[PDB]
Scaffold this active site. Structure first.
Site, PDB file in Angstrom:
ATOM      1  N   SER A  20       0.815  -1.210   0.000  1.00 48.57           N
ATOM      2  CA  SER A  20       0.000   0.000   0.000  1.00 48.57           C
ATOM      3  C   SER A  20       0.855   1.270   0.000  1.00 48.57           C
ATOM      4  CB  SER A  20      -0.950   0.001   1.200  1.00 48.57           C
ATOM      5  OG  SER A  20      -0.241   0.122   2.420  1.00 48.57           O
ATOM      6  N   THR A  95      -5.095  -0.688   1.663  1.00 51.21           N
ATOM      7  CA  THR A  95      -4.683  -1.890   2.386  1.00 51.21           C
ATOM      8  C   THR A  95      -5.893  -2.777   2.674  1.00 51.21           C
ATOM      9  OG1 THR A  95      -2.850  -0.661   3.426  1.00 51.21           O
ATOM     10  CG2 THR A  95      -3.290  -2.752   4.304  1.00 51.21           C
ATOM     11  N   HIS A 256      46.565 -35.729  19.965  1.00 50.01           N
ATOM     12  CA  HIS A 256      47.531 -35.205  20.928  1.00 50.01           C
ATOM     13  C   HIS A 256      46.889 -34.900  22.278  1.00 50.01           C
ATOM     14  CE1 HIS A 256      46.007 -31.145  19.942  1.00 50.01           C
ATOM     15  NE2 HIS A 256      46.558 -30.786  21.088  1.00 50.01           N
ATOM     16  N   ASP A 310      47.263 -36.194  13.431  1.00 51.24           N
ATOM     17  CA  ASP A 310      46.738 -35.795  14.734  1.00 51.24           C
ATOM     18  C   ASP A 310      45.215 -35.826  14.727  1.00 51.24           C
ATOM     19  OD1 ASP A 310      46.573 -34.871  17.348  1.00 51.24           O
ATOM     20  OD2 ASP A 310      46.792 -32.788  16.873  1.00 51.24           O
ATOM     21  N   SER A 428      42.130 -26.904  21.518  1.00 53.62           N
ATOM     22  CA  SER A 428      42.557 -27.826  20.471  1.00 53.62           C
ATOM     23  C   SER A 428      41.697 -29.089  20.473  1.00 53.62           C
ATOM     24  CB  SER A 428      44.044 -28.163  20.605  1.00 53.62           C
ATOM     25  OG  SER A 428      44.267 -29.124  21.618  1.00 53.62           O
TER      26      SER A 428
END
Ligand SMILES: *[C@@H]1O[C@H](CO[C@H]2O[C@@H](C)[C@@H](O)[C@@H](O)[C@@H]2O)[C@@H](O[C@@H]2O[C@H](CO)[C@@H](O)[C@H](O[C@@H]3O[C@H](CO)[C@@H](O)[C@H](O)[C@@H]3O)[C@H]2NC(C)=O)[C@H](O)[C@H]1NC(C)=O
Ligand SMILES: *[C@@H]1O[C@H](CO)[C@@H](O[C@@H]2O[C@H](CO)[C@@H](O[C@@H]3O[C@H](CO)[C@@H](O)[C@H](O)[C@@H]3O)[C@H](O)[C@H]2NC(C)=O)[C@H](O)[C@H]1NC(C)=O
Ligand SMILES: *[C@@H]1O[C@H](CO)[C@@H](O[C@@H]2O[C@H](CO)[C@@H](O)[C@H](O)[C@H]2NC(C)=O)[C@H](O)[C@H]1NC(C)=O
Ligand SMILES: *[C@@H]1O[C@H](CO)[C@@H](O)[C@H](O)[C@H]1NC(C)=O
Ligand SMILES: *[C@@H]1O[C@H](CO)[C@@H](O)[C@H](O)[C@H]1NC(C)=O
Length: 497
Positions: A20, A95, A256, A310, A428
């Site tokens: 609108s 609307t 590790h 690893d 890690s």
């Protein structure tokens, strides 16, 4: 409250966009961007969904219908949303929210006819109507009449509220009149603001499925919810480590981490839990540490620490309940990761590597002890060598080093340049992951590095830029496929190499 995300039944999503005079052309453009993301998100859960696209002002315009098979096709839906034009409602500027909701009802009535009233194919469909509007209804009569009609054709009860959800979102506005249409009414400024709120509109708790790489995209959600694959590992050491769920009872970590013996009956895995603050802790049924890992393997050459191969896999003693707090991450080169990438069926592991690692500097992540998400740049191609070469300056670890390829091989990914965060020792084993179309993919595995930010150490994380210099190397899961296959072939469906 909330739209349900589950494998059961079907979801019809209807996106209604205001056009609108009230809504300026710049406002409708941010509705377009907001509707795209909603479509992108709802298709990232791998559930059966259909998206209807409607624009409305004086009359509704249906650009995509759930009667169309293309409403189940992400590409098609978004293209019919990209082709949406604001000027299409220039000849009718009011609307009429009733007529627009009636459109959805006329679509539901039609879909009843297609499938059948008494059929499972109809009654399993859950309906969600989202109005990207500001309110200010001015023609067509009361929107309540249409909402009542939808309730009647869907048979909505206290035991059937799960089947109807109406939302009205203002972006760029009448407060209590949006609650009339819909707390199912929101006033928002940014599109990134709606991205947050759309996360809260979704209910995933009933997705006990083993789907990978699914997380929560908003703040206000816990760290564990954003990175639900993240686990904490304790060996016979007190030395903390991290890892990642790759299925319901397998976790990927660094070898590790277990430098004190392979007796796993003293190791603990800490998984996220929806009820617990501290998360559920799991014992290990068996461990698979790479046979090739050996820190002091290059000791005679001068190299004190060598992190080749690893990598380690832990089987938990019990299955993990998939939840908002604990899901597996997508591992590349699997059918799991393939569907997540919306790839074609004939995809290979080579295809996946090219898709995921595509640039010479790729933004990835890893998770901190903090739990929060940190940013890094993986350096590929020609940038990799100049990334790796810097290891030639460290002489605390490598005294008689002449060849860089001895410590750092293509088996490692490289990050840590410029403004990258470096992982600490406790971090890690943690995953190095990417985000693609709202899904998460582990490309790597934190192994070693040249500088530890937590080695301050006292309690902090310091960088410093006159040290020669900080840099980080992660195990490249692509270079690790024959092993992963060897041990996970029952757990994941791998793709051709
Ligand atoms: C909103 O209306 C406009 C204008 O249409 C109005 O024209 C008035 C003279 C009167 O008849 C009104 O009843 C009518 O609403 C409309 O834009 C175009 O209008 C022109 C001229 O009237 C049309 O030529 C054009 O339709 C097509 O134009 C093509 C390009 O020249 C021709 O090749 C083709 O043969 C055809 O005539 C109208 N539309 C287009 C496609 O450009 C506009 O479409 C409308 N907005 C909406 C709701 O889409
Ligand atoms: C992202 O994370 C948030 C959590 O921060 C999720 O929102 C939360 O959704 C849950 C599940 O519905 C809500 O918990 C409970 O819901 C039940 C429904 O039966 C209710 O009985 C309980 O009282 C409780 O509310 C929780 O309220 C809600 N949190 C907030 C603040 O909205 C959200 O679903 C996640 N989004 C995605 C896409 O995963
Ligand atoms: C978790 O750790 C991260 C990284 O150490 C913290 O992020 C930093 O926060 C400080 C204080 O606000 C800022 O000065 C830095 O700029 C942040 N680093 C970056 C770039 O992420 C984070 O604040 C910690 N979370 C908490 C509050 O515990
Ligand atoms: C989704 O589609 C599948 C096949 O495409 C269909 O068999 C099923 O009814 C639908 N629901 C799910 C997710 O199983
Ligand atoms: C999450 O945080 C946002 C931004 O601070 C806040 O507006 C909102 O109240 C919180 N949760 C939601 C989306 O309701």
């Amino acid at each position: 409250s909330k739209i349900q995300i589950q494998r059961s039944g079907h979801l019809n999503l209807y996106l209604l966009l205001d056009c609108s005079q009230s809504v300026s052309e710049n406002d409708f453009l941010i509705f377009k961007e907001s509707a795209s993301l909603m479509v992108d998100r709802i298709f990232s859960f791998e559930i059966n969904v259909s998206v209807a696209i409607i624009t409305f002002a004086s009359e509704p315009k249906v650009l995509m219908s759930v009667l169309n098979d293309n409403s189940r096709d992400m590409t098609e839906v978004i293209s019919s949303l990209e082709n949406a034009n604001y000027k299409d409602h220039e000849n009718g500027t009011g609307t009429n929210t009733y007529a627009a909701l009636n459109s959805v009802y006329l679509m539901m009535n039609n879909q009843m006819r297609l499938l059948g009233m008494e059929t499972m194919a109809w009654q399993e469909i859950r309906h969600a109507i989202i109005l990207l509007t500001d309110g200010k209804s001015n023609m067509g009569g009361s929107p309540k009449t249409a909402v009542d009609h939808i309730r009647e054709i869907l048979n909505i009860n206290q035991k059937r509220n799960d089947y109807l959800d109406i939302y009205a979102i203002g972006v760029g506005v009448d407060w209590r009149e949006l609650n009339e249409l819909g707390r199912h009414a929101f006033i928002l400024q940014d599109t990134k603001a709606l991205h947050q709120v759309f996360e809260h509109m979704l209910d995933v708790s009933k997705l006990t499925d083993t789907i990978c790489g699914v997380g929560n995209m908003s703040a206000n959600a816990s760290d564990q919810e954003r990175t639900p694959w993240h686990v904490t590992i304790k060996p016979k050491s007190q030395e903390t480590c991290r890892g990642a769920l790759i299925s319901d009872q397998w976790v990927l970590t660094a070898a590790h981490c277990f430098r004190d013996g392979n007796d796993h009956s003293l190791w603990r895995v800490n998984v996220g839990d929806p009820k617990s603050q501290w998360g559920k802790e799991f014992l290990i049924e068996k461990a698979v540490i790479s046979p090739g890992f050996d820190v002091f393997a290059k000791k005679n050459q001068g190299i004190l620490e060598f992190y080749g191969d690893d990598i380690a896999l832990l089987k938990l003693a019990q299955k993990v309940k998939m939840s908002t707090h604990a899901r597996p991450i997508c591992l590349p080169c699997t059918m799991e990761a393939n569907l997540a990438l919306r790839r074609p069926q004939g995809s290979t592991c080579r295809d996946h590597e090219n898709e995921l690692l595509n640039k010479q500097s790729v933004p990835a992540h890893f998770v901190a002890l903090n739990g929060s998400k940190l940013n890094i740049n993986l350096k590929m191609g020609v940038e990799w060598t100049s990334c790796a070469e810097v290891v030639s300056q460290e002489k605390t670890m490598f005294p008689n080093l002449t060849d860089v390829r001895e410590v750092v091989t293509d088996q490692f990914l490289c990050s840590g340049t410029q403004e990258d965060e470096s992982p600490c020792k406790g971090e890690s084993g943690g995953a190095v992951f990417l985000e693609r179309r709202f899904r998460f993919f582990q490309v790597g595995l934190v192994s070693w590095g040249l500088y530890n930010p937590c080695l301050g150490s006292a309690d902090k994380r310091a960088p410093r830029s006159k040290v020669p210099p900080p840099r980080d190397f992660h195990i490249n899961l692509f270079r690790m496929q024959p092993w992963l296959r060897q041990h996970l072939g029952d757990v994941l469906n791998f793709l051709p190499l």
